[PDB]
Symmetry: D2
Subunit: 422 residues, 4 copies
């Protein structure tokens, strides 16, 4: 029965053709949904009660579109998101962190506009986790956004939006200096021929997967759901194909910001992503990611590949990782394990930001410290297990891979352990 | 010999990649498609696309198959639609550069437990009006196909039956349905109501894979460019859907309300044409051909053996085309199953086979009507040169190009056993 | 039949990994195919008798090597005459006649920088006596090959030059030597003295791989069955060495003292024949063909394009043979480079080409002696039928087998362009 | 280039020219062959063990010391010749030569003692002489038994029964010497600790031209099972009378190592030949060259794909450690082992990194020579009061011996494999450590 669920017969196939032939509509997904959902906040999704329903439906990142509304409007949106998120903090083992992302207006006819400098400063002052930088055309555009965030905003992630021919052509230099990329298909589909957008999307997703950096697929994914309760056949296909391409995040714009069915749009993306993740051909995917990733003398990099290899060998239910900045969880995520990467962190910001990496489930550790560091480590590992059992990731008898470091502080991950649950 | 510019077009750097990941990374928006569009476009005929003048524009835009939806309209209405399609098609008989055969497909209303009374009458109408294809609605088991086959009476056994998979039972009994059908249509509209909407992509990808493995045509249908019923440009999800259906391995892509009742039927055909061309160049032939090769069982049928040898030869020299002589379309279909990058120019004396080969990806039919030569080998050479001269006229070929020529050792269907490498003079 | 798929290591050949392939090797799986790796026997006092040479031809000797390091021109002329007398004693039965090449192995440069004066005299002797191949000793650079070519003069243009790599400089300048040579010999005797003995296997495997990639013949030579000079059976290391040279990809295997001066020259040839047959069935064609196909560059040469198409077609139907008409042996060589499992039966009128094609693995030469038919297409058909009748007589073919037939569109060398699937009747 | 560029800048182009690294990074087996370089020197320690047969030519304590220095890892006693008194003196001479180097524990080399039985002869099962010889082996503390002419699983059960309750730790390596042994191979391997391809008798029992098929098949199946396989007989035969081997003999040794043999053997070459030490030196030289020429890229992928999924933490830690070692070009994998099992599970994935096995068991240290790439270190220190400190001391002993023998240098990365509690069967931890 275990080997009939989550497309396991299709995953064991020797060729991609055989894998496609073995896909079964009756094979139910069992793993937790790995691809994060970014929902744009607007009139249709601004109330605290509506936001609680969207968090329950699967929203992981709240997007504020600074192309519309005043700073006062966005500050109220941020406050409503935080109020809805903290209404579930009473149960720490099931609490779900939600990242706040600021999408800039852009340069327009102009480098960095004066409105963008003011909006970026607003973001730092209001503690946003991510910036979706509009119309990035070169590496210097990223440096300008980084400078406008100042010294108080060093920790904010910059996701560069590729929206035109120049951004596509200078992609490598942009990715090198960015934390991740957004395939902004709306403007891209106007700037380049509409029939070429799929080539740009597939290329950028592939290069981001190669680099181990987050990639977001955005715009018109479930467009008809702005007015209709069910999407079209092309829309469900689009969401499934973005997940199959290798997108870490999928986004909703008007579907959540102004549409009549914002919660239903989030539920639909959740349902499709789960089905598409089970249909991923891990046999060739892991081999290609493994082969393409360069040799490394960094112990976090070395422990990550060893842990993902160990997880596949035993069909581990999860990889529990201790992370300060989210980096150790990101290096596990780049190898696309089938096992959930449960990231136990004390940093509330890192817990929100790791939603950018596919298959990373953040757990914000709010338990008292232990005097002995070794006891403190084991306690964070046990917290990971208890929250995993509560959320359905783990059961007694399961095997897990535990990834820790040899000394406190970020940058010292070097240990992988095989642990039997209970 | 060919130049650096040649190897930068039609995603050739991405096609030469050693891994699928590298192939994706090398896809270039500046790499222009050069080959002719190989995925056929099926357009549904209705009030928005019924006039002879409108049909001429749709033929010019790229329509290869005209679909008549028997769920609406009378026999008199559909007979007028058929006559208008044939009039628009025959208006280009004077120009060899513009003439293109167009298949006529009858989509049945559907079942009740088995074949309905109206379906029996509509199938009979199809035989009487010389339709080429039947899109059989709600096929659930092999006996449903046998009923449609029996209804195609004594005169209609040459009509192709494309079974529409629209429900859970059709998906579950897929192998037995495909075995007795000529091809499959992934009818996503009803399938998306019968099974959870989020599972349709699994059924589509599975059916396309199994049809590619069997070497039988597969059509992807419904809501591909839905928003173009009222808007002049499609959404980002719609262009993605068309591209992904072509990348999945669909032989045909379809337009329903977009052409039957929408405000932009010609623009919807142009959009599918443009996306299919881009997606065909992005196909990863290196692994695709190896997997089609490995999955296909060993064969002692000379047509099947010649076809794989010809596709291998075409890839080795970057052949501009594979010219094949075919009476039933079978030789062109067996070439098409290996997904060559070279166009398969099928020269035939059968008008029906010329229309029906539009079901197979990459087959470009040429109807030959010259009186037969007394010496058979001269008749063969005349048809081979007809294919070369038409290929030059349409832009597929130039002097100095290499073509692969597929023929048999004696006249009559079923004896293909020869593959020649010819230099265009 | 099930019995067919149990023989010639077919279960091991169908394996998905090389590890599974090794695990499926069966000592009870008997080889069925004809032995494809040629045996070169060095001629000497133990193998000069016309009666002894007839037994060696029957045992499997394909090339007779004359070592010009020993004996006078008078001695070698008598060796040539004895070989030709033994070879021609079987010419009364043209369907079973076996051509035998004569190769001249030069003395070498010695302490000198380039071509010695004795080598110039020996090379002219070879041209005057009609030798087919030259095994050029101690080739260190491309200019050494050019000097051998110049010493053969205008009359020795058709002689094949196989460069012997016997020292560190030859290994280091391998690419430039292979580019100008017709093939290579891994001369392990001197190589094992010039470089550390424990590194010879790396040089052998490297040179065989590069020759396989270039599609040029490679010979593995020296001490393969050394103990058989005095003992009737070889050691376990010796049989392993022969099997591994064949598995590495050697086109030819050689006997030196074993045939020139030993007590068991016929048995040494029989032993190499027996081992080579077993090792050829154990070749993992699934990965080998895929890698040869992938590594070979794209080509606009019709012989090159037809060869890959014909090898692909032969694998698709498990063809018993590929019958090829050739004037210079080039069409058979281009088939051979893809390492088909099917025997390459080469029909030629050139007695020299028939002898020289023994350098290419899996090429079985048939010398056609009939004067031409007035109609060229009938002359082509008669030769193809001669190929089939010889194949049936020798055990390569049976009624019901499938064969691939490779021919050209006009007479003369260089115009091969047709591949045909034929059923044996 | 991009997948090795940063590591090439760090370790240097000279690092990536040695030990056939350009050939190992090739995308196809054809390219791998084309890139083999005679100028690419082997850097790693020799990982295929050498078994030398002891006889009149190699019996003296002084001769045995030279053979230990030349590379002998296992001493074979052929019970087809000589009395129990003769073999007891051979055992005593081997132990005396081995212990003459015990003064330096960081460089001491353990040597296993193997008893090769006479066989059943005309009989159906275990002979009476075999029962007496097997009892002699237990009484004299032999580490391994090479059981002659094993034809079915019941033959190995009989050998195990004849070893009694005191010989439970002795490894049984079944010799496949005839058609029946080849045909019933799977049932024999299942109950044996390993296999020996006994080519001498096999080459008489089956056609000589088919022995290579049996050798390659058995080596492949043993590699798949993760059990030791020995290639034996006539490997360097001409060295019985000549100082240098033939071209076929060096080729045979190299091909046995390339096939996947854990051990290579010398019979008459050491037992009665004129050049026993030179024969050991030649096998050492060839094995080093052949190990560097192994195509790890496809080999590791095939061993991973063929090995079934496992819920055993030792099994899971071993594959994770070998994957980690390949990612950073680790100089070694240091493993703590009681029975040798954890080192054996690392060895089955054929890492390029040396598997330095630290053990307190003198028998396990001798027996791990059966597994390719396992370098045993016998730890003689008394236990620390705190178990975690005792573990750390053992790991440091592995690093210090590794630096002393040339396996490790400051700046190298090492993979350390340990367990969570004392006793055999609890290996579950993999650590990446930088050598200081
Ligand atoms: O899982 S993968 O290894 N799939 C590789 C893959 C994909 C396409 C092709 S193919 O050669 O395009 C092809 C298409 C149809 C039938 C065929 O026989 C072959 C061959 C191999 C993969 C590798 C990547 O690097 C990537 O970014 C995405 C995916 C992927 C994952 C799951 C899917 O369902 C599809 C693609
Ligand atoms: O080293 S390997 O990865 N090589 C695999 C391998 C071996 C042979 C072939 S092959 O297809 O026979 C080939 C391809 C190209 C050129 C040739 O001359 C031969 C393809 C791939 C290997 C993989 C295994 O899983 C294994 O158990 C053993 C060996 C191996 C051992 C000894 C050899 O001589 C060769 C390979
Ligand atoms: O993922 P990051 O940011 O590198 O953090 C991983 C770190 O977490 C730890 O496991 C625990 O460290 P802390 O005690 O500081 O929380 C470290 O040993 C390791 O370096
Ligand atoms: O594709 P089909 O229907 O099998 O037709 C292929 C047939 O066409 C030919 O190439 C030419 O035949 P005709 O001259 O009868 O048209 C035959 O040799 C071959 O058998
Ligand atoms: O392999 P080669 O030397 O190029 O010979 C191939 C030639 O043999 C043929 O098949 C037969 O030609 P001939 O009639 O001259 O023998 C030609 O069509 C072809 O060009
Ligand atoms: O390889 P084996 O025989 O299973 O031994 C591995 C064992 O060695 C250890 O690392 C250390 O154990 P000891 O302290 O008993 O020597 C254990 O944690 C582990 O179970
Ligand atoms: O800004 C965006 O997200 C776009 O243009 O698609
Ligand atoms: O009938 C159709 O085409 C459907 O249901 O999708
Ligand atoms: O010359 C040779 O044949 C040799 O040196 O091996
Ligand atoms: O007994 C043996 O060792 C043999 O036959 O090789
Ligand atoms: K914006
Ligand atoms: K209908
Ligand atoms: K010579
Ligand atoms: K014995
Ligand atoms: Mg935009
Ligand atoms: Mg329907
Ligand atoms: Mg020499
Ligand atoms: Mg024996």
């Amino acid at each position: 029965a275990f080997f009939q669920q989550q497309q396991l017969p299709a995953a064991m196939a020797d060729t991609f053709l055989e894998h496609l032939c073995l896909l079964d509509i009756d094979s139910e997904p069992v793993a937790a949904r790995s691809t994060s959902i970014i929902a744009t906040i607007g009139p249709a999704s601004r109330s605290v009660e509506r936001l609680k329903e969207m968090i329950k439906a699967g929203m992981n990142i709240a997007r504020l579109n600074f192309s519309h509304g005043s700073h006062e409007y966005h500050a109220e949106s941020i406050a409503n998101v935080r109020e809805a998120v903290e209404s579930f903090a009473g149960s720490p083992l099931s609490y779900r962190p939600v990242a706040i992302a600021l999408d800039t207006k852009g340069p327009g006819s102009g480098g960095l506009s004066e409105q963008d400098v003011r909006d970026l400063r607003f973001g730092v002052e209001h503690g946003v986790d991510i910036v979706f930088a509009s119309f990035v055309r070169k590496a210097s555009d990223v440096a300008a956004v980084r400078a406008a965030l100042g010294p108080e905003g060093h920790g904010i992630k910059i996701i560069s939006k590729i929206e035109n021919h120049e951004g596509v052509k200078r992609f490598d230099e942009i990715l090198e200096v960015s934390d991740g990329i957004m395939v902004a298909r709306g403007d891209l589909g106007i700037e380049i021929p509409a029939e070429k957008v799929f080539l740009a999307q597939k290329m950028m997703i592939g290069r981001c997967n190669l680099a181990g950096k987050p990639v977001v697929c955005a715009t018109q994914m479930l467009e008809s759901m702005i007015t209709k309760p069910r999407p079209t056949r092309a829309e469900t296909s689009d969401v499934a194909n973005a997940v199959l391409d290798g997108a870490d995040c999928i986004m909703l714009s008007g579907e959540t910001a102004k549409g009549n069915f914002p919660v239903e749009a989030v539920k639909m993306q959740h349902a499709i992503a789960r089905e598409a993740e089970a249909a991923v051909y891990h046999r060739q995917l892991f081999e290609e990611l493994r082969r393409a990733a360069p040799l490394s003398r960094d112990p976090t990099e070395v422990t990550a590949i060893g842990a993902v290899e160990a997880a596949f060998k035993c069909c581990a239910a999860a990889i529990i990782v201790l992370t300060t900045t989210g980096r150790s969880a990101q290096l596990l995520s780049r190898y696309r394990p089938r096992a959930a990467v449960i990231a136990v962190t004390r940093s509330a910001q890192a817990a929100r930001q790791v939603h950018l990496c596919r298959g990373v489930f953040p757990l914000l550790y709010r338990e008292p410290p232990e005097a002995i560091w070794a006891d403190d480590v084991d306690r964070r590992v046990q917290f990971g297990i208890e929250s995993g059992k509560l959320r359905g990731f783990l059961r007694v008898g399961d095997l897990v891979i535990v990834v820790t470091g040899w000394r406190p502080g970020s940058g010292y991950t070097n240990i992988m352990r095989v642990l039997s649950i209970s």
